[PDB]
Amino acid sequence: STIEEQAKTFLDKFNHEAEDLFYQSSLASWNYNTNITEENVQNMNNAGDKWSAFLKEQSTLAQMYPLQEIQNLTVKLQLQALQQNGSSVLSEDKSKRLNTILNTMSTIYSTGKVCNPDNPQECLLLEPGLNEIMANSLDYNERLWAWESWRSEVGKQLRPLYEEYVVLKNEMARANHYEDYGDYWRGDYEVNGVDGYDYSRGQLIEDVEHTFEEIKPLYEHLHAYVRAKLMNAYPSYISPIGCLPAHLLGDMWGRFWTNLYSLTVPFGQKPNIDVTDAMVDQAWDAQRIFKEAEKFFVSVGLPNMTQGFWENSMLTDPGNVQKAVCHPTAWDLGKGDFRILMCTKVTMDDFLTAHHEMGHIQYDMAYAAQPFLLRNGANEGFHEAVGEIMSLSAATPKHLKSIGLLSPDFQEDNETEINFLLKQALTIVGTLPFTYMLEKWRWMVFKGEIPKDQWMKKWWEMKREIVGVVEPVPHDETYCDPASLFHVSNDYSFIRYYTRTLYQFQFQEALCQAAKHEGPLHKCDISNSTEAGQKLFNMLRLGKSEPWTLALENVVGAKNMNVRPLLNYFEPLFTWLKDQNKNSFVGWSTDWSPYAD
Amino acid sequence: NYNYKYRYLRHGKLRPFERDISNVPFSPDGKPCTPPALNCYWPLNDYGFYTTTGIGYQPYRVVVLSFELLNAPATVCGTDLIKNQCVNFNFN
Incomplete structure (x- = not known):
């Protein structure tokens, strides 16, 4: 009939042929990343190559339809996904060269090890070893050695x-009518044809800088506080007015700073909200942790998973006989087959991670009614946000207080309150200028605002100015520690965690509005209050058929990111930071360096 | 087990008890095709049962117990013995 209906007919042919192929592809990936065998690495990408040729095949077969003649937004947004030319639109030499460069970076980032300069037998890779030396070791030389050798x-x-x-990837992105590959990131945030809910691409840089300008004083006070407590931790190694060395920040770069909390604790003589030892001492296994997380998901109004989850998922690490990757990943294999792969130990971090990935699967089960490429987030930035919602609500003292942990005659006084505030605050505050700086850096390098012979020089100057982080030993352009970062070398964005960090506390204040919580945000447990889970479900199931501005306005009432709810979560803690930073310098200085002193 | 196929392209609904067997190349207004022609694909596809999947993607066998009513005498219709009591009958 009309072109709209045969666009629907052909697109339904595409999804109904695509579903079994993507199911076999994701099964190939599951049976690879649950038992690493050579048959698994050969058959993993074979069902992936079968799928990737199928998609560019149907991309070539769908573009012949008219894009600007379709009235329905819902199937024109289907056409926007299939008329996305992808990364195969180049010279066939440079497309495979870009794919081989990405694979070579992915190999040498993960296979790489550090070695003792006098002993070529003590060699250590990243996870474990270097993520254990960089976090809780107290030796200055050993943290600096692991830090610098992972870069060297x-x-x-x-x-x-x-x-x-x-150059190759920005050539691809320019071939796809984008500015750079950062603009290819922002084009996912771009939505078209909705008349009011739309999105321009420069708005992402605009609005990230918008919220970053008021993260700067909050991050400034907390950076001054953790600088003073690292002065308590590392004598004669950190200047009080200066920045922080990146080997002392808990992680390899400066992204997560929650590992500083054990040495940046406010109140060292109060019972900690971290109930990991309480989870071990009350004798939980992996199964009880996932059942308790499932109990909280039932408490917020959300159902259980499919039977394939509790039937087939790897809830426990098999060990040496069956090796498996231990990243907690929410696997969405298609055909309603929903799994979580996680080498689960008994930890409140693992408990909140069970909440996190079960919230990811909950997001998936909400968009289970959507068609195929619509079965994803509205943006890339609400998937991790919805995952982090149940972890933020499931970390409160009221939550763990009546889980069975954290004895229920516990005082909610301001001491342990600001303790739990500052524990979550090292995470939330340390992740924002690193994400701002890293995405601004990649927008600079991908657009061309940093010249290629000054990546590492402007890199650490952005670490010193924006993040307030010095490098302890100098870096020429021989290095590329951004290329020695995880999310950069493997062709991914990182601004979804920035948007996550803002819209997380936005959604948390909106759900605690639904929960009818009265004080500040941290005491709010949304368990037993189905209004919060229902208000999450008001946005949880629409997906990409409507813009992420619409799903954001359904819950918190905006079309844009905002610095207010994170600051309202930190505001009594911000009064506490103002109470604490009177005896230290408020700021950081780019002229300090542990190699130039 | 993809061997139970569903017919999903036909012009219009099925009639009362319509048993569609004929496999024709389908285009949405007739127009005799042969695949892989444009808007010319098959009316049949595979279910996609694996036991690993969700509950509604598991294979269920359905009998329809179809009622047609009294077009011939009684075909299927449907009281233990009592002893030493005044009972009623209807034997064979």
């Missing part, structure tokens, strides 16, 4: 690959 073995090899990668 692989980042020197990762620099020419990223050097070619930026």
